[PDB]
């Protein structure tokens, strides 16, 4: 078997990094449990590589996860930070909270999209064995 999950993730100015955690009993992998860090572009790399593999003609290939969009929150944030003398006391705290809620919503959506993609692959008889998928899970 081959179980994949994303237990944490990090939003920076220009990228989103996901921790990709694998547990497997399969002998092809270097070890039975490991974790790597991947950006969204690595998932798109994986998806496009699979789509372009001619031996996979006829196979259902799961759709790529959506591009995370933190642009709104991040800015509100970058400013609320520049506005340390911005009416808080309290308001700064209140605005930090509302913005955290906005980040949590985007994280929940995008972690779910990224994780479901990997899980669909893990269960695919052919794609689960793909060498590029293995690189994606193990490269560190």
């Amino acid at each position: 078997s081959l179980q994949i999950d994303i237990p944490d993730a990090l939003s920076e100015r220009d990228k989103v990094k996901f921790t990709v955690h694998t547990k497997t009993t399969l002998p092809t992998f270097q070890s039975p449990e490991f974790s790597v860090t991947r950006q969204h572009e690595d998932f798109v790399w994986l998806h496009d590589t699979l789509i372009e593999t001619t031996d996979y003609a006829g196979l259902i290939i799961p759709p790529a996860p959506t591009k995370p969009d933190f642009d709104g929150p991040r800015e509100k944030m970058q400013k609320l930070g520049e506005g340390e003398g911005s009416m808080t006391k309290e308001e700064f705290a209140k605005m930090k909270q509302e913005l955290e809620a906005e980040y949590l919503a985007v994280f929940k959506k995008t972690v779910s999209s990224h994780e479901v993609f990997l899980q669909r692959l893990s269960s695919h008889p052919v794609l689960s064995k793909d060498r590029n998928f293995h690189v994606f899970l193990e490269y560190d």
């Binding site: 999950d5 994303i6 237990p7 944490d8 993730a9 990090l10 939003s11 920076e12 100015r13 933190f70 929150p73 944030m77 930090k96 955290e100 980040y103 949590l104 994280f107 929940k108 972690v111």
Partner: peptide
């Protein structure tokens, strides 16, 4: 930067605004 932790053993994803 904002760090996300998926919730563990009952409870509750969390987010923290990263600081140094």
């Amino acid at each position: 930067a904002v760090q996300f932790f998926k919730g563990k053993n009952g409870s509750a994803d969390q987010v923290i605004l990263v600081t140094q």
